[PDB]
Design a protein around this ligand. Structure first.
Ligand SMILES: Nc1nc2c(ncn2[C@@H]2O[C@H](COP(=O)(O)OP(=O)(O)OP(=O)(O)O)[C@@H](O)[C@H]2O)c(=O)[nH]1
Ligand SMILES: [Mg+2]
Ligand code: NA
Lengths: 173, 291, 1038
């Protein structure tokens, strides 16, 4: 097995934290208690090419709780920029998150995630999400609440870091 | 003048005279392609064929231990384990001597499997509808930890929270597939009413299991049968050839009729249960608790 | 190792701090503390900076120290002594000089460099024009003497540019930014020259690539002269576009230029396109399988293609009207259109979505040129029919390929996600607005356009495909799904008469395909597609009863099918058909005597007895739509009775048992039955609508009674054993009965059409059963959907429920409030719903707010301030909408509206600024600006009484202007009097221009983050000052 450092950035309330704890408990936090600076969480996925460990660096979206922001990014190998499809502002700032990130990590696989798709009253129509295109990033509609496309951001990065397009998740012992 | 596609021939099985459709007479007397009018034939060869080419011992264990490693054939999971009837069309010449009839209730057909300290109910589709404790051998936390499983065939009636036992295919880790209906039924009615609280409701046994009576199919019997009262509402009547083993899937060796279809498919009385299918505040409460 | 350092007055070391930073990046739960302490080394100042980068893992500590230096520069630069600012710039410049040159600059990460340069840009934002005049000249001269210095200086220009033209809005104030923009433009010649010099002469690949990279960020803003009236396009295409390590950056540049409006440079674009196409035909031969090149490609060959997508699509979409009229470009356009087709076959969803973006645009541009099919026959003289529109002519052969495309790669229409709800209840959810389904919509739209310009081509393409499945043996489930998905999409795009011949032939073949195919695996797939198809074309079904009948009957038998999935298929289809063909089931058709519904009802059990619980619910909703069609109220009532005959007898059996032993409503199985019986009532109600009152009215009182029972049960349990109990099968089963009961109740009142009837009958029993019960539950036990149920019904009844509001607000208001007034986290669903309820009340029942005591009102209004303090975006928002709406409801009430201004105006005003100047409430900017604007505008006339209380010589305007002034001056004492005057003026002159009001607020949000100091004055008063009155006059002009 080998591991990687995954920086997870986004605005406040995006669902970053709720996203990661679903992954290591299968439980869903309805509360919004903001992260302070960052909290590193180890995630393990079992693939057909051995185990793989992500070190999720769940950073804080709120300006006052930012901490050592770009400081955290240093030596990252993959990222997950997230926004809230029920809040246009969150998508309008993605470029700021992506900016701070690539000045530190000038070539790493990055995934863009629109969370909250489960919510009926959506404000960021799929038509508008186009930032990823000219930045050669991957995009996914996700839901921390329903598990919609839950593991996608991780399957893609793993496929990229291992260099195997046909890499799969299996959940072996 | 439409020229409209024969969507009526759209079919997935090959089951003859499927009760999944109306009687083979209401739509086409000469029928459709997977429907018949001659049950007599196949009946005979099918039981002239019962010479165990099948490991029913191994199969009972597979249902109970949910193990399907596999290291004309028997279904490989929880679906399609029950033995289903076709409409009764070719009424037997010996009906009143070789056949029997079980009055069936309005409810849900289930495959009941009790092993490893629990009990589950499945549909014909193997879809789990319930997981519970029961007093069938293997079906509660107090049991033998060692091949004491039980597989039953039931209709679950909602109003009575009772699982009416229609047949037994495995009891106390011993299969009854290879046994005739005569024997299978006798066994139920000698052992079911001999289990502690099986037929009553308690903490370890939330669902009562009652065995369904069978009767003879002689003109006298059938009359008195349709004249009876039952602990439930009547759905229809199952006719079993006494000699049939228990084969998962459809067979001709058991046929099905609705109450009204009976006194016009053979010849019997028709009175009781056989019939084809200041302002204003106005609602008054049963319970009657606080406003 | 405590490792804390708040001790400046002591000689503070380096080896130690350098040990915590390694912890932050390397070890574990100890690292929390490390990260937690470096956050704290940002208190006093940065007198450490100098010795931290001086005496040096290594680069990581220097990096950390840079962040600190970075802060003071963006913050206190102005109030710093000039001589010290000068030390920084020299230290920073020098530090840049050294690191660059070093033969080991690729190792001492670009990270450290990127940070230094970035800090330099930071400094430049501060004084580049006025105190650093020779900057651009200097760096240019330096870039010309040393390449190493040129390579980095090119990064300094990319950063500076994107800090002034890309990310200035928000970080920089509006007037300041325009001055830097101006400054960047008045001196862009010398800059652009250097770039050209490098592109022509420099043979240094890293230096050159980076000049193409800095150019890519210059194309965002530089004057078009430098682009079209120079050889830039010419250099890019001839020199870099072809060579591997320049293809991607070079193409992206081209893509940026192609995106401009052409009004003035039509010629340049032309020779830009044809010149590029030459080079591509030499790079990517037209005969090469692009899918595979992508399939078997690396990151650079893969991005080149995605980019190719971008270039092609961006250019065609915008200049395609020009590749046409000019008759010389007709071949390059066909090659380009040929490329899009090859790129369209790449197995990547994001690329296809770009390619699809164009096709949908071509098909749409030609649909409005003419929505009709080319008159289908030739002229009597054999000549050209001429019905062909001039533009569609140019694409005919291509349009055909695109139709094939849609039909060969159609996206799945519906998206199903199985996932169990917060009960352990397992269900199938239908996603609604996912990108994936947007893909389907788009695909559909594109093919539907194409089908309008020539459906024959569509119907033939689909026939070849379908036949290649029958015999052609292109057979596979994936392909047979895609085809029928496609066939289903164009439903309604044909004339009703062709639709007939098409349907009948399509499905006859499929029916044929089902017989020939052996295996229940193959047969179900096919039968399902047939059912999907026959489902999308209700038009046909509505006009062929016998068929409709044969289809429903066939579905009924499929409902006993046990092969995986089928039973799901048969139910979805059946509800679909009943929804859209409902009138045919309740009315007598030609060929029988009684309405089909009867059969269906006389046989419910025999049809449904093999179905799972949820399928049974879907079936019941299906027949619900049928009964809703029977408008004869006598016959409709009889139908409803029998419709509900099965669920009722279970229900009626359980109830009699509880009228003997209320503890039967504690039995796990009876509870499981109660939930499913209700779920059925909820579905039936959804489809039948108001008339369902006959059934609801019949179980209503008893139902609310089991509700209270179950609710008292849960609460007891919880009070006795804590929240933990809610995670056990019976308490979740009990929650379910409550939740569905509330759905049932709010579901019907929604679709009810007799307000007084609902208010006099079904509303009073809600009080004792549900509201006082919510009140009497322990906090951890109260059902949040009680509040949202109430909300829905107030939304519905409004005026008819205004007199009950007090009694309702009693039960739930203060008690709920006490659960959410201690922090901003606990009981989220209560916060959300409580305020949805308060909104519906303020919105449709405002006269209530006046009836209650002046002090309950204050309590109400107080909670609204509590809402918009929330960091949960949704709650804060609802909080602003209530306030904004509230103020206007107050406006109508002439008499008692002057008291409101007296008591609350200044305070609400104070509370709004509170969250405006808070960095965590930026998503409320728009509403913040809306509300204040409304209030200041109100100020300028409507506040007819005196607030200050020293007579009229203290007119309210001046008062508000002086109250807001000190408000900010006392809250932000570092702001100089001039910054604060500016702001207050803006609040009154912009009172009618909301977008401009917004930018004003944001400008203030920048200044307050900086110590602009009474010292230096970069704020452009006189300039900005008038521009405010240039908006004041717009108000009273037009
Ligand atoms: N409906 C819905 N809500 C979600 C979803 N994901 C997260 N949430 C909610 O949104 C909020 C997410 O909060 P956090 O996970 O802390 O978001 P965050 O601020 O980016 O994470 P941190 O700042 O690092 O703590 C919580 O209230 C969740 O209940 C989702 O997929 N659907
Ligand atoms: Mg946060
Ligand atoms: Na950058």
């Amino acid at each position: 097995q080998v591991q990687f450092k995954l920086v997870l950035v986004g605005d406040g309330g995006t669902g970053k934290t709720t996203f990661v704890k679903r992954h290591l408990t299968g439980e869903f936090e309805k509360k919004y208690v903001a992260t302070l600076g960052v909290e590193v969480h180890p995630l393990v996925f079992h693939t057909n090419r051995g185990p793989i460990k992500f070190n999720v660096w769940d950073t804080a979206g709120l300006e006052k709780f930012g901490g050592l922001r770009d400081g955290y990014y240093i030596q990252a190998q993959c990222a997950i920029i997230m926004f809230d499809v029920t809040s246009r502002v969150t998508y309008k700032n993605v470029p700021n998150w992506h900016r701070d990130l690539v000045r530190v990590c000038e070539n790493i696989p990055i995934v863009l995630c629109g969370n909250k798709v489960d919510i009926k009253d959506r404000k960021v129509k799929a038509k508008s999400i186009v930032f990823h295109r000219k930045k050669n990033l991957q995009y996914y509609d996700i839901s921390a609440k329903s598990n919609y496309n839950f593991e996608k951001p991780f399957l893609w990065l793993a496929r990229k870091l291992i260099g195997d397009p046909n890499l799969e998740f299996v959940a072996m012992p | 003048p439409l020229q409209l596609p024969p969507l009526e021939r759209l079919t997935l099985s090959q089951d003859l005279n499927s009760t999944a459709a109306p009687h083979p007479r209401l739509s086409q007397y000469k029928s459709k392609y997977s429907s018949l009018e001659q049950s007599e034939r196949r009946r005979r060869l099918l039981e002239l064929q019962k010479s165990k080419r099948l490991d029913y011992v191994n199969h009972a264990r597979r249902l109970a231990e949910d193990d399907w490693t596999g290291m004309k054939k028997l279904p490989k999971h929880y679906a399609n384990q029950l033995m289903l009837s076709e409409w009764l069309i070719d009424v037997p010449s010996d009906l009143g001597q070789e056949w029997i009839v079980v009055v069936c209730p309005v409810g849900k057909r289930a495959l009941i499997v009790a092993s490893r300290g629990s009990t589950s109910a499945y549909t014909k589709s193997g879809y789990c509808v319930n997981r519970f404790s029961s007093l069938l051998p293997g079906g509660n936390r107090r049991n033998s930890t060692a091949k004491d499983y039980t597989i039953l065939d039931c209709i679950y009636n909602e109003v009575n929270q009772t699982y009416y036992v229609l047949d037994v295919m495995c009891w106390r880790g011993h299969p009854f597939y290879d046994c005739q209906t005569d024997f299978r039924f006798y066994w139920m009615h000698s052992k079911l009413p001999e289990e502690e609280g099986l037929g009553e409701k308690t903490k370890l046994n939330p669902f009562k299991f009652v065995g369904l009576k069978n009767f003879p199919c002689t003109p006298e019997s059938l009359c008195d049968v349709l004249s009876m009262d039952f602990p439930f509402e009547v759905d229809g009547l199952l006719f079993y050839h006494k000699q049939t083993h228990y084969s998962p899937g459809s067979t001709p060796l058991v046929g099905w009729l609705r109450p009204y279809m009976v006194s016009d498919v053979l010849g019997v009385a028709v009175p009781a249960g056989p019939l084809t299918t200041s302002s204003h505040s106005p609602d008054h409460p049963g319970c009657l608790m606080e406003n | 190792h405590a490792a804390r350092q708040l001790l400046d007055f002591s000689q503070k070391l380096d080896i130690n701090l350098l040990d915590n930073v390694v912890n932050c990046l390397y070890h574990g739960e100890g690292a929390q503390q490390r990260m937690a302490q470096e956050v704290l080394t940002h208190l006093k100042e940065h007198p450490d900076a100098w010795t931290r980068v001086d005496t040096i893992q290594n680069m990581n500590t220097k990096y950390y120290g840079l962040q600190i230096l970075e802060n003071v520069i963006k913050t206190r630069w102005k109030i710093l002594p000039r001589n010290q600012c000068e030390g920084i710039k020299k230290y920073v410049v020098g530090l840049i000089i050294k690191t660059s040159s070093d033969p080991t600059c690729v190792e001492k990460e670009k990270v450290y460099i990127g940070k230094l340069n970035m800090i330099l840009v930071q400094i430049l934002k501060q004084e580049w024009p006025k105190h650093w005049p020779t900057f651009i000249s200097d760096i240019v001269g330096a870039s010309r003497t040393s390449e190493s210095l040129c390579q980095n200086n090119m990064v300094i220009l990319k950063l500076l540019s994107e800090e002034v033209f890309d990310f200035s809005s928000g970080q920089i104030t509006q007037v300041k930014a325009k001055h830097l923009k101006d400054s960047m433009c008045n001196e862009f010649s010398q800059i652009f020259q250097l770039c050209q010099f490098v592109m022509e002469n420099s043979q240094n690949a890293p230096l050159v690539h980076a000049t193409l990279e800095t150019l890519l960020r210059f194309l965002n803003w530089i004057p078009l002269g430098y682009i079209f009236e120079t050889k830039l396009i010419s250099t890019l295409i001839y020199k870099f576009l072809n060579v591997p390590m320049f293809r991607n950056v070079s193409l992206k540049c081209l893509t940026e230029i192609a995106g401009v409006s052409v009004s003035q440079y039509e010629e340049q674009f032309e020779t830009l396109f044809t010149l590029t196409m030459m080079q591509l035909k030499q790079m990517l031969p037209l005969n090469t399988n692009i899918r595979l090149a992508y399939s078997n490609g690396k990151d650079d060959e893969q991005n080149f293609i995605q980019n190719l997508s971008l270039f092609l699509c961006t250019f065609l979409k915008e200049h395609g009207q020009l590749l046409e009229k000019r008759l010389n470009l007709r071949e390059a356009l066909m090659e380009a259109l040929h490329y899009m087709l090859l790129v369209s076959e790449v197995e990547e969803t994001e690329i296809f979505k770009i390619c699809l973006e164009y096709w949908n645009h071509l098909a749409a541009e030609l649909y409005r040129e003419s929505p009709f099919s080319t008159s289908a026959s030739p002229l009597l003289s054999g000549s050209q029919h001429f019905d062909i529109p001039p533009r569609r002519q140019l694409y005919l052969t291509v349009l055909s390929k695109v139709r094939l495309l849609m039909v060969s790669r159609m996206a799945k229409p519906e998206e199903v996600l199985v996932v169990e709800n917060d009960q352990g209840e397992v269900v199938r959810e239908f996603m609604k607005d996912t990108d994936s389904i947007n893909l389907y919509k788009n695909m559909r739209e594109t093919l539907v356009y194409l089908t309008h310009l020539d459906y024959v081509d569509t119907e033939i393409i689909m026939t070849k495909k379908l036949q290649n499945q029958v015999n052609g043996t292109e057979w596979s489930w994936k392909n047979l799904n895609t085809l029928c998905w496609a066939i289903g999409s164009i439903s309604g795009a044909m004339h009703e008469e062709d639709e007939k011949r098409f349907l009948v032939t399509v499905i006859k073949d499929l029916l044929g395909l089902c017989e020939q195919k052996r295996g229940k695996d193959n047969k179900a797939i096919i039968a399902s597609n047939i059912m999907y198809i026959v489902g999308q074309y209700p038009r046909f079904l509505r006009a062929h009863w016998k068929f409709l009948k044969t289809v429903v009957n066939k579905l009924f038998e499929f409902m006993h099918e046990t092969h995986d999935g089928v039973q799901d298929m048969a139910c979805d289809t059946f509800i679909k058909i009943a929804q859209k063909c409902r009138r045919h089931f309740v009315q007598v058709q030609v060929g029988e005597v009684m309405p089909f519904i009867d059969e269906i009802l006389n046989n419910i059990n025999t049809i449904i007895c093999d179905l799972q619980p949820q399928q049974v619910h879907t079936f019941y909703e299906a027949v619900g739509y049928m009964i809703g069609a029977q408008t004869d109220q006598t016959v409709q009532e009889h139908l409803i009775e029998k419709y509900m005959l099965l669920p009722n007898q279970v229900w009626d059996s359980i109830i009699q048992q509880a009228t003997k032993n209320v503890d039967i409503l504690k039995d796990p199985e009876t509870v499981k039955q109660l939930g499913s019986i209700l779920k059925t009532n909820v579905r039936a109600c959804k489809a039948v609508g108001h008339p369902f009152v006959i059934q609801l009215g019949r179980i209503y009182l008893d139902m609310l009674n089991v509700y209270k029972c179950l609710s008292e049960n849960i609460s007891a349990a919880i009070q006795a054993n804590g929240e933990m109990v809610t995670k056990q099968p019976l308490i979740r089963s009990m929650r379910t009965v409550k939740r569905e009961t509330l759905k049932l109740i709010s579901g019907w009142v929604s679709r009810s059409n007799d307000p007084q009837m609902v208010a006099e009958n079904f509303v009073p029993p809600l009080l004792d059963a549900v509201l006082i019960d919510y009140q009497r539950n322990v906090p951890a036990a109260r059902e949040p959907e009680v509040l949202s149920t109430m909300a829905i019904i107030v939304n519905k009844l409004g005026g008819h429920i205004t007199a009950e509001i007090p009694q309702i607000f009693d039960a739930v208001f203060e008690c709920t409030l006490n659960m959410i007034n201690k922090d901003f986290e606990e009981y989220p669903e209560h916060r959300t719903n409580f305020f949805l309820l308060l909104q519906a009340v303020n919105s449709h029942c405002f006269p209530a707010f006046l009836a209650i005591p002046p002090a309950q009102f204050k309590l109400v209004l107080d909670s609204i301030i509590w809402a918009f303090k929330h960091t949960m975006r949704n709650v804060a928002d609802t909080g602003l909408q209530i306030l904004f709406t509230l103020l206007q409801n107050v406006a109508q009430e002439e008499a008692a509206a002057q008291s409101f201004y007296q008591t609350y105006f200044c305070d609400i005003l104070q509370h709004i600024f509170s969250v405006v100047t808070d960095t965590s409430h930026t998503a409320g900017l728009t509403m913040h600006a809306s509300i204040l604007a409304y209030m200041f505008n109100l100020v300028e006339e409507g506040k007819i009484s005196t607030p200050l209380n020293p007579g009229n010589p203290v007119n309210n305007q001046m008062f508000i202007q002086d109250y807001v002034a000190n408000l900010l001056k006392s809250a932000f004492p570092h702001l100089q009097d001039a910054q604060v005057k500016l702001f207050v003026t803006g609040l009154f002159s912009l009172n009618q221009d909301i977008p401009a009001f917004k930018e004003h607020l944001r400008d203030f949000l920048v200044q307050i983050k900086e110590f602009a100091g009474e010292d230096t004055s970069d704020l452009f008063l006189e300039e900005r000052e008038t521009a405010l009155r240039q908006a004041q006059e717009e108000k009273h002009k037009l």
